[PDB]
Design a binder for these strands. Sequence first.
DNA 1: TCAGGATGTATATATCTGACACGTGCCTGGAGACTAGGGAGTAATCCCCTTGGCGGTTAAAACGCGGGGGACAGCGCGTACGTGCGTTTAAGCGCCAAGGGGATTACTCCCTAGTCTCCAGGCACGTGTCAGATATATACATCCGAT
Length: 311
Amino acid sequence: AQDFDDWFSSESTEEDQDKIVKQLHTVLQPFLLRRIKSDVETSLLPKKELNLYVGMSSMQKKWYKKILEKRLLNIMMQLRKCCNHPYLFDGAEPGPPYTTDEHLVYNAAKLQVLDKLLKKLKEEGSRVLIFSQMSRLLDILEDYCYFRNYEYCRIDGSTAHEDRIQAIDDYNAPDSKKFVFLLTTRAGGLGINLTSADVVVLYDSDWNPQADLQAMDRAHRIGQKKQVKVFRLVTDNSVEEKILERATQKLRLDQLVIQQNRDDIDLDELLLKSENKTKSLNAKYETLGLDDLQKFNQDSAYEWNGQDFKK
DNA sequence: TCAGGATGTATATATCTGACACGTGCCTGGAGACTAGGGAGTAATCCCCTTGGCGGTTAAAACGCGGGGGACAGCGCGTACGTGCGTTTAAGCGCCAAGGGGATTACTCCCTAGTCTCCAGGCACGTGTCAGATATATACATCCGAT
């Protein structure tokens, strides 16, 4: 192990990072292969990443602060919950009695952006795939979809086989009244084919970039006819930014190592600002080096606006 | 049911003996230095535990049904307990005798512990293995529900 882990794995020596160890793919080219599907058939249209940076709402603000200064362990997971929808937390939503009115969208900034974009795509007429990462979050999405009078088909770690096949077939009927079609990002194996869809909204980003790559390939898989778009909601100035940063670290690591040597927020302004942020971070991480890329800076996310590790 | 008994149940009085208050001294808790080592805070490393989600195998668990036998209700009945009365008998209470047992109370010493100072050699840890305990199958002999 240590031989590979030290000879051209992580060091701290010199500009070796891109002068020698980077050039040392000659160890690998002998026995490894991959034929880039981007240009061997040239029949698919490329991808469309439209990361959206979103800020907390008041309920998110107070809940985020509550977790920062307190069953609740694994704080890094809880902050992801609060960044998605506070209704995941017990006793957050108003009630009882429990209703399903605009008090649902009224407390989740991602869900507000999602609702606006869902209306916009619906009037365009692009049936959409939602790839959440918590099945419990799919419950709130189901409730919202029903309250907005859309119909769906949910597949996750609960539905048995026959349910999965019949739901897929129902969505893929040649004249199917299926607008939204929920799933979980790492579920369904690989046989699930949804080329008939048009948009994949990555409600959450994943630690492993290739998990989402395979996920957002469920619509980009061979056979897809028209250019597709894949949104990725991000909670600006929160843990999700750290997660996206580390995921991009790993994605560029993969590319360098292998892929070379083959209220409303006025949606348009948020789109442009988030696109500028994406360009800025891409510029930040493009120029990194192997040993430099492997640091995993592990910036403690407990402190967010000034914290003291106290309750 | 009601009047006839039998039994607690309040009530006033006198007795007493046990709880309480009071002075002494002697012993222990408090004030006051002095000091050293236990513990709080810090840094580094590694293994375990969390939270949310997924996929799969496959025995247990849930459900329904039918039928028996165990439960619970009654019916005698014939004891074996109760209740009451008379009468011994023993518990308790005093008293006699002389000792030994024991618990302070106060010196003495011996000797046997604790303390320190090296220093080897017991033991815990990290390495192999191979022998015992598995799971498998099969033949058997051995209880259980109907004549």
